[PDB]
Ligand binder design. Structure first.
Ligand SMILES: Nc1ncnc2c1ncn2[C@@H]1O[C@H](COP(=O)(O)OP(=O)(O)OP(=O)(O)O)[C@@H](O)[C@H]1O
Ligand SMILES: Nc1ncnc2c1ncn2[C@@H]1O[C@H](COP(=O)(O)OP(=O)(O)OP(=O)(O)O)[C@@H](O)[C@H]1O
Lengths: 53, 360, 404, 176, 132
């Protein structure tokens, strides 16, 4: 495939709602807003690792 | 402590605190100017001395400085609370132009310095007040009438329809017919008298021809009404001739369809699947729907139009006129909605388009 | 700079679509057909005015094969749109319009002249529907399969430009389905009664003769208007009942499928079986259609393959790699699945066939308008407007140069 | 799959902070775009403090450089025995308009006022002209046949019937 | 079988149909239309994402309202994230930083070359061909 990086999704964790939120991608909105684009997985239930020892 | 809810209409303005069960202050939206400015009832009595203008027409604001004075009066005099201390929620008519939203947001943030604000569509607020997920809302206020289908709270813009028949036209028509019977109403005072008569007496007939025959023969449909001067008048067949214009616009001289036909067309315009739900969750709203007996006539008409296998069910709460404001009052008090506010810093960084980014 | 207060129009043989630039869905969508009464004539345009019956009223449309023919009717339509739905002076708003891929030069020139001189707009621009459809899905290169009311066409797009040579047209479209439905009803001896004739109806058992009464107060209407109402009823039936078979039509297998229930305005209701599948099969194999033995007609899949095969070889992998489906007629149930099966079977294995998933009404019908809004929103696009000062000289000269 | 958009809310613990700051006024204003030669003015939403600043998108107006020549140059250097001057001028005008997108150029090329040409021929002619002009312009101090063969081979592969594809697949697998 | 597959390789004829030659090249820098196309792609993605969020938020609010009414009767007896995460911290991986999709930027210098969808002919050159 083309293998571009800006179209990639990766696992991430937020700080305030502290939890792994599955695959996500960062993007810039219309005016200045920075948004997170979230993908889907059938293992979404198990992704709550946190702190990864 | 809580936020404010302000609803603007062509005929009446309604303001109150979120969580209350009824608006705290209701007054007519008129601005008087010398021949300082005056607003509401104070202008109404002064209207003999003053010149009057209406800042809203057919649910669309047409003069902004007058609207600014209306909002200033509302807050400072009627609510007696400084706006900068409270969040403010606002209402909007369907199919409103973008420029109106942007101008409203600019005024609200810059002139009044509100810390946060939101804008909602009146039809969806009425649906919230009813407490249903999918349905079609019939809205008929003082100036304009709309039919809006909703699917899980998402108003389908392309299926929406509009109609320019409302209470103002009915009051004028009642004046016309009452003059034609032999009375004399010319100026705005007699117009208010006629509006009071319309509100007090008129009702919707279930079968127009049978009621016409009854009024032709029987005295059992006549009434009397007392004027401010202490003299009395007689009123008869006019009682149900006026509201009938809703289902027969030809009386007013307009080549338009009735409210039932408009609702049926709006329902048919949507997707095939969701039609079943819309028939069973039809909602009425606005002051014009307060006529006694309207619900049964509507049900009969739509039953005649709709397919036999469908189930039709009209909904009309007793307080439906304030239902639009009640919906906004419920929404603001919710917890999850708190995250939907537009903050002042967001307006500063982004600009008025932020309203096109959030208020849905 | 992405928020210039521009308007975007999209007009088709079925409905007119208009809205504000930067919005996500068209604001207003009303039918293109209008009523005209002679003695200049008088026009009744919107849905409310159209339903009311009247004497000597005829039904007309300004479009012919995707190009404007009745300029007076078109001007009336634009006047109604502006005045009623937009409620703002045209002189303030730049306008963007869509056009058919094969629209000729002279009609483009006359449209530009009309807009600039009569409506006095400040800026103007024109684009072709295929490109806007490609933009809506975010593709610069792809193949567009459009099936509207009039024609079913395949248009290849590369780097945002339409390849004129590759365009292929077929007449099998919604109107063909409507004609097939009329033939079916005539075969079944079902009488079609438009709603305006019915005064009231009673419930009747399935298959029994209808029971209804006529509105005595109706003034006599013309032929075209009555035919148009019948066509509206048949269009509703199309939307409700028809379905496309996953495989090639087989009478024996179809006969085993469950039936469907429909009720006409006059209260008549009957159950349809294999007939609801046999009809749409025409779009995929016109040869076996009764009364159209001419095998020169091409099916949808064959149209796509022929259109792609006529383009430059190096681009063919790009076209097969992004196929976009658009148009109202594609909304028929199971259409996309049959198309995908056919294309995946017939395409060479070496190419990675892919179909863009957009199977919903709003984006399937309003794709061109959405693309137009997206294009008008772009900040860098502001350089490309045609201005009134530019209209003076280059309005005729540069319009040829400006919009290829 | 959803998407969370940033927000500064979820509570009203921010009664302070927000109550001590005031927004910068905005404005609906006109602006001038340098990329437009006519000087037309369009209206704009912008912060009122930044009036008069040039349009920040005009830095994207970059053109592809295509040579030019006069009658004397075409007289001396670019004369060819299979192309008329008008045909070459049409080719170069199209190249300037469409930015050397040769597939689009071949699509829009007038094939009836001028004899039909393949895209490889257009590329060859354009490169020859540009190379000779650059060479002359230099102070003292492409391959069409290969592309044609490649495209012919691709065309031959494309029209391969499915049984031939299966036969090739079987032979390939036999070689592991 | 080896004589028959040497017959078959002389059949399908490496001289006939099997493996192919190189593509040529000529460099060229980006132009205005390419920037417009990239901006169009970004805008289309934004449009779709916004609409979809829009539907989801409406549904959630409606469900909350109906459940509030239900709770009122019985008494008779995920879509946003904080500002700090949006504009601070880089989500470093440890053992690099995650990307960000921003709108195009004007060229600081003539260094960005125009690329395309040749696709089939894999990109980047060939270092060692035969002695042509
Ligand atoms: N039975 C009734 N009770 C009260 N008002 C009635 C009744 N029948 C008609 N009306 C008229 O309804 C109008 C009040 O409607 P309402 O308060 O909903 O208007 P609004 O909010 O100004 O409308 P809009 O938002 O559509 O511009 C008044 O003109 C009143 O005369
Ligand atoms: N839900 C539906 N199911 C099936 N067919 C439908 C549906 N909605 C519309 N159609 C068909 O699509 C036609 C309208 O197609 P569309 O909206 O693409 O028209 P258009 O773009 O205005 O037409 P044209 O390009 O030919 O002028 C309708 O006449 C009907 O034939």
């Amino acid at each position: 495939g083309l293998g571009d990086v800006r179209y990639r999704y990766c696992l991430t964790t937020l700080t305030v709602p502290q939890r792994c939120i599955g695959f996500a991608r960062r993007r810039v909105g219309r005016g200045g807003r920075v948004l997170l684009d979230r993908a889907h997985s059938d293992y979404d239930s198990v992704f709550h690792h946190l702190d990864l020892e | 402590i809580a936020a404010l809810v302000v609803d603007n209409g062509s005929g009446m303005c309604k303001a109150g605190f979120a969580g209350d069960d009824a608006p705290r202050a209701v007054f007519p939206s008129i601005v008087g100017r010398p021949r300082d400015s005056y607003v509401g009832d104070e202008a109404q009595s002064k209207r003999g001395i003053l010149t009057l203008k209406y800042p809203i027409e057919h649910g669309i604001v047409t003069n902004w400085d007058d609207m600014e004075k209306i909002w200033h009066h509302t807050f400072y005099n009627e609510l007696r609370v400084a706006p900068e201390e409270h969040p403010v929620l606002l209402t909007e008519a369907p199919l409103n132009p973008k420029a109106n939203r942007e101008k409203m947001t600019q005024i609200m943030f810059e002139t009044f310095n509100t810390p946060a604000m939101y804008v909602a569509i009146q039809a969806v607020l009425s649906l919230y007040a009813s407490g249903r997920t999918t349905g079609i809302v019939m809205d008929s206020g003082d100036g304009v009438t709309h039919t809006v289908p909703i699917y899980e709270g998402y108003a389908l813009p392309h299926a929406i329809l509009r109609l320019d028949l409302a209470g103002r036209d009915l009051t004028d028509y009642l004046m016309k017919i009452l003059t034609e019977r032999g009375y004399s109403f010319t100026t705005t005072a007699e117009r208010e008298i006629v509006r009071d008569i319309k509100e007090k007496l008129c009702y919707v007939a279930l079968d127009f021809e049978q009621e016409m025959a009854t009024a032709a023969s029987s005295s059992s449909l006549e009434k009397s009404y007392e004027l401010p001067d202490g003299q009395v008048i007689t009123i008869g067949n006019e009682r149900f001739r006026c509201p009938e214009a809703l289902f027969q616009p030809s009386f007013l001289g307009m080549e338009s369809c009735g409210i039932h036909e408009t609702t049926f067309n709006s329902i048919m315009k949507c997707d095939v699947d969701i039609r079943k739900d819309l028939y069973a969750n039809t909602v009425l709203s606005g002051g014009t729907t307060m006529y006694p007996g309207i619900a049964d006539r509507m049900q009969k008409e739509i039953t005649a139009l709709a397919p036999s296998t469908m189930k039709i069910k009209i909904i009309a709460p007793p307080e439906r006129k304030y239902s639009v404001w009640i919906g906004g009052s419920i929404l603001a008090s919710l917890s999850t909605f708190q995250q939907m506010w537009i903050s002042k810093q967001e307006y500063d960084e982004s600009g008025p388009s932020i309203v096109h980014r959030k208020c849905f | 700079g992405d928020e210039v207060g521009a308007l975007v129009f999209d007009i088709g043989s079925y409905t007119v679509r208009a809205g504000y630039a930067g919005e996500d869905c068209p604001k207003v969508d009303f039918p293109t057909a209008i009523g005209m009464v002679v003695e200049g004539p008088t026009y009744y345009i919107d849905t409310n005015a159209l339903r009311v019956p009247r004497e000597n009223m005829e039904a007309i449309s300004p479009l012919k094969n995707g190009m404007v023919e009745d300029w007076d009717s078109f001007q009336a339509i634009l006047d109604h749109t502006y005045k009623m739905h937009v409620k703002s002076e045209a002189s303030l708003h730049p306008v963007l319009m869509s056009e058919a891929p094969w629209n000729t030069r002279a009609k483009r020139e006359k449209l530009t002249e009309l807009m600039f001189e009569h409506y006095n707009i400040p800026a103007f621009f024109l684009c072709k529907t295929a490109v806007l459809t490609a933009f809506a899905n975010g593709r610069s290169t792809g193949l567009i399969l459009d099936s509207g009311a009039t024609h079913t066409t395949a248009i290849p797009v590369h780097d945002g430009y339409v390849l004129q040579q590759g365009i292929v047209k077929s007449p099998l479209a919604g109107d063909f389905i409507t004609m097939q439905c009329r033939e079916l009803f005539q075969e079944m001896n079902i009488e079609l009664v438009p709603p305006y004739m019915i005064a009231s109806k009673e419930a009747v058992r399935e298959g029994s003769p209808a029971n209804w009464k006529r509105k005595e107060k109706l003034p006599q209407v013309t032929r075209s208007w009555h035919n148009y109402m019948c066509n509206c009823v048949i269009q509703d039936f199309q939307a409700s009942v028809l379905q496309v078979s996953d495989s090639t039509y087989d009478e024996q297998v179809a006969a085993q499928m469950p039936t469907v229930h429909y009720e006409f305005p006059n209260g008549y209701n009957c159950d349809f079986g294999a007939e609801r599948l046999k009809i749409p099969e025409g779009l995929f194999d016109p040869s076996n259609v009764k009364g159209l033995s001419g095998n020169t007609m091409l099916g949808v899949s064959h149209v796509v393959t022929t259109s792609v095969g006529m383009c430059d070889i190096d681009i063919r992998p790009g076209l097969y790699g992004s196929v976009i489906v658009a148009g109202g007629n594609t909304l028929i149930q199971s259409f996309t699945d049959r198309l995908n099966r056919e294309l995946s079977q017939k395409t060479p294995p070496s190419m990675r066939l892919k179909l863009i998933a957009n199977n919903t009404t709003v984006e399937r019908r309003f794709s061109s308008w959405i693309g137009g809004s997206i294009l008008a929103s772009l900040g860098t696009f502001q350089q490309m407007w045609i201005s009134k000062q530019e209209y003076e000289e280059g309005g005729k000269q540069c319009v040829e140069r400006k919009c290829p | 799959p959803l998407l969370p958009s940033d927000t500064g809310q979820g509570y009203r613990t921010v009664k302070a902070k927000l109550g001590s700051k005031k927004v910068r006024p905005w404005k609906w204003m006109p602006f001038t775009n340098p990329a437009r030669k006519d000087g037309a003015m369009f209206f704009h939403w912008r912060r009122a403090a930044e009036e008069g600043k040039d349009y920040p998108f005009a830095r994207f107006n970059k053109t592809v450089q295509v040579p030019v020549y006069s009658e004397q140059e075409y007289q001396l250097y670019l004369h060819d025995d299979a192309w008329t001057k008008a045909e070459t001028d049409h080719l170069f005008d199209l190249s300037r308009r469409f930015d050397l997108r040769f597939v689009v150029i071949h699509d829009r090329y007038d094939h009836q006022q001028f004899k039909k040409r393949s895209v490889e021929d257009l590329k060859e002619r354009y490169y020859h002209i540009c190379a000779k002009l650059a060479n002359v312009r230099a102070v003292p101090g492409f391959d069409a046949g290969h592309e044609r063969r490649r495209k012919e081979q691709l065309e031959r592969l494309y029209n391969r019937t499915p049984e031939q594809v299966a036969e090739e697949e079987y032979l390939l697998q036999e070689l592991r | 079988q080896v004589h028959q597959r040497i017959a078959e390789l002389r059949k399908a004829g490496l001289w006939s149909q099997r493996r192919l030659p190189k593509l040529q090249e000529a460099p060229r820098p980006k132009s205005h239309w390419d920037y417009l196309l990239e901006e169009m792609q970004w805008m289309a993605t934004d449009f779709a994402q916004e609409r979809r969020w829009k539907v989801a938020a409406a549904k959630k609010l409606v469900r909350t309202v109906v459940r509030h009414h239900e709770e009122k009767q019985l008494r008779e007896e995920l879509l946003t994230y904080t500002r700090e995460d949006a504009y601070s911290m880089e989500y470093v991986y440890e053992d690099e930083v995650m990307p960000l999709w921003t709108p195009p930027t004007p060229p600081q210098d003539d260094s960005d070359i125009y690329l395309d969808s040749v696709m089939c002919l894999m990109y980047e050159a060939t270092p060692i061909p035969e002695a042509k």
